[PDB]
Every structure is written in C-alpha cells, then in structure tokens.
Subunit: 214 residues, 2 copies
C-alpha cells in the first residue's frame, strides 16, 4: 500500500518467487502422497499374511486361535492403549482376530476391529472413522450390538438390579463433533492418541508389542 | 516362552512377516529422505532469488534495502514469533538481510540470521543449531558480540549506572542440554516452537507473512 515504485518491483519479484515455491511445494506433496500409498499397498499383504497365520479360518470360535490372546496381549504391552483397556474388557478382547487401518474412498482413516463370534455382541466388525483436513473434523464408530446382560459399558445386576455405567476400552466406539470446551477438547485429545498408537504402532509392530520388546 | 509347538511355528511366520515389514519401512524412509532433499535443493535458488531482490548487494548499511523492514515485518505477522520479538528488538531486526535453514554435514538443522553491519554487534551472521535424533538432543547458538552500551539483553544506564536483564528475541541465541525439570523443559518447548515456525512457515512464506495474509 505505502511503498515506492522500486520497492513495488521488488515485490513483483517476491510474489513471483513465492508462486514458484508454492508450485514446488505442490509437486512434493504430490510425490509424497504417491510414496505413502505405494507402501500402504506394499504392507497390506504382510498384514493379511499375519492374519492368515493367527486365524487361518476354516473356523474359529475364539480370537486368533493359532496364537491365543495375541491382539489383547499386544495391546496390553503399549502404555497408551493399556491405560484404557480395563480388566473386564479382557474377556471381550480375547475374541479379537484382527486390527486393520484403511483410507476412505479433506481425507481420513477407518480403524477396523474384526472379532470372532462372541457372547458379548453380534458385530463381526467394529470400525472407528476419523475424518480430517493434521486437523480432526469428526468421527464415526459402529454401534456395538451388545447382547442382554452383556453390556460391559454398564455396571450389571445382581442384588431388583442396580445399574451404574463404568469405563471401558469400548467407549472408544462412539461418535463426536465440534463448533465446557475443555471437557469437549480433552475427550478428543485422548481418543485420538489411542487411534494413532493403534494406526502407527500396534498395527505395524503387533508381534513386537506381543513379544514385549517395545 | 510358554507356547505349544504349533503356536511357535505361527510365531516364526509372524517374526518373518514383521521382518519384511521392517524392510519396506526402511525402503520408504529412504525414498522419503530422497524426496525431502530433492526439494530442499529445488527451493534453495528461490530463496536466493528472493534474497537477491531484497538485498542485491553492491552495498548495504541497513536491512533488505530494496524492501525496507521486510524480515522484521514478516516475523511480526507470525503469532508465535511476534510474542518473543519485543519493541527494543525492532531496531536491531531492521538490519536483518536474510533468514536461512540448512542441514548439517542422528541429524539436525542450522537456522542462519544474516545481518547488515549495525551498531549493535559485529556478527555478520548469527546461527542456532538444533541437534536431533522428532527428539531434540541439544542446541548451539553463536555468541553475539555486542558493542559497548549496545547489549539489549541487559537493561542499560543512565541514572553510576544501574543494570537489570530483560527479555529479548535475542535470548534465542543461547545453547542448551539435558539429562526443576519443568523449568528446564519449558525453556526447550518454547524455544523449539519458534525455530520451527521460522524453519517451516516464516522462511517458506516470508512475503505472505509480510503482506499480512497468514
């Protein structure tokens, strides 16, 4: 606004060079996004080969039958995840055959929890979908179809029942938003920390967490 | 330790697949590290072309003479950096011709502050070097060779002088370590936030911060 004409030509040049920067930045972001996919694909089969070794499914009525309690125990050896896995959850996570991560067809990712048929719920898969633009927009999770007397999220009977909700890993499968705000924020920062650990540590290094060396 | 032999063969397979993962992970990290360099280089000249436009040096006795107060004002339009730039620093940052970032020949990066000859100090460049392995190990910065009565870091004369240190952007050019701990941590988390802003926002988008659109 308030410059000499010489200083304006210097700005043209600067505006010019800053445009060229923005182009190269794009070329990089593109190439980087190639590179991430190229390898997301490379990994897939490995994850499947590992699933095949744990499950090998002509049948199953318990989780990862070729190596019982694999996922539970691998989850339990992560510090961040273990915090939220309580002892009453253990007998549900035992039926877990698999954990997977996908991209969706501003982006995001779905975390898939594949379970064997179990007395707790009918869902064969529970997913949690993180929408993003980095910066998180909102989440979707599947509504667990708990069986009668089998909602761990809630207390239980026995002594006229008396009922009172309690913490559980499976409070992970709820949905959120946002336009007081700390309570609201603090739920998002803890939930995302878990999803990230799973997505980038548990899933990649599962057996290493199992073996107990991370 | 406590498995059946079938479950052991399932572990061989898992150990096997987790090795293959680690290989692909390496291939990616390599390719990614190609890609970052490839473009660090691509940018260089642009940054130089921009320096050439601001300075164009057959001479200079003030900062960025072809567009006075460019860097100062670009720094002042960043929220994180501006916080630490005080008003007494302004008359020193005015002599700033350039800001650059380099890699070093576990890694790190040097941030270079190139100044025109000025009444505050003789240093033609002030650098701050962040050593890392991500996770920060320790920093090096240049000892500013302040001239007599020209140390802004410290109060001043006039009314037998009376002296008392005070905050300044240029407390940025100090060195650190670590094996109470919060005071120690809190210095590192604020200092690094500044270096990062410069390295990834100011330097790349300098004129845009100047123009006042970020």
């Amino acid at each position: 606004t308030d410059l000499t004409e010489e200083q304006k030509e210097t700005l043209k040049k600067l505006k010019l060079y800053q445009k060229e920067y923005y182009d190269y930045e794009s070329k990089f972001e593109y190439e980087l996004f190639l590179l991430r996919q190229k390898y997301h694909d490379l990994y897939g089969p490995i994850y499947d080969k590992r699933r095949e070794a744990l499950v090998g499914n002509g049948e199953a009525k318990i989780g990862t039958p070729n190596l019982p309690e694999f996922w539970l125990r691998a989850l339990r050896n992560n510090n961040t995840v273990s915090h939220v896995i309580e002892d009453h959850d253990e007998e549900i996570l035992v039926y877990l055959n698999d954990i997977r991560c996908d991209y969706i067809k501003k982006e995001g990712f779905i975390l898939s929890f594949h379970f064997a048929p179990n007395p707790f719920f009918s869902n064969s898969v529970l997913t949690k979908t993180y929408h993003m633009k980095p910066v998180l927009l909102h989440t979707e999770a599947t509504v667990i179809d708990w069986y009668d007397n089998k909602n761990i999220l809630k207390k239980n009977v026995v002594k006229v029942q008396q009922t009172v909700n309690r913490d559980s890993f499976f409070h992970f499968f709820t949905s959120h938003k946002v336009p007081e705000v700390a309570q609201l924020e603090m739920i998002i920062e803890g939930d995302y920390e878990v999803a990230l650990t799973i997505k980038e540590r548990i899933i990649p290094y599962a057996v290493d967490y199992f073996l107990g060396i991370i």
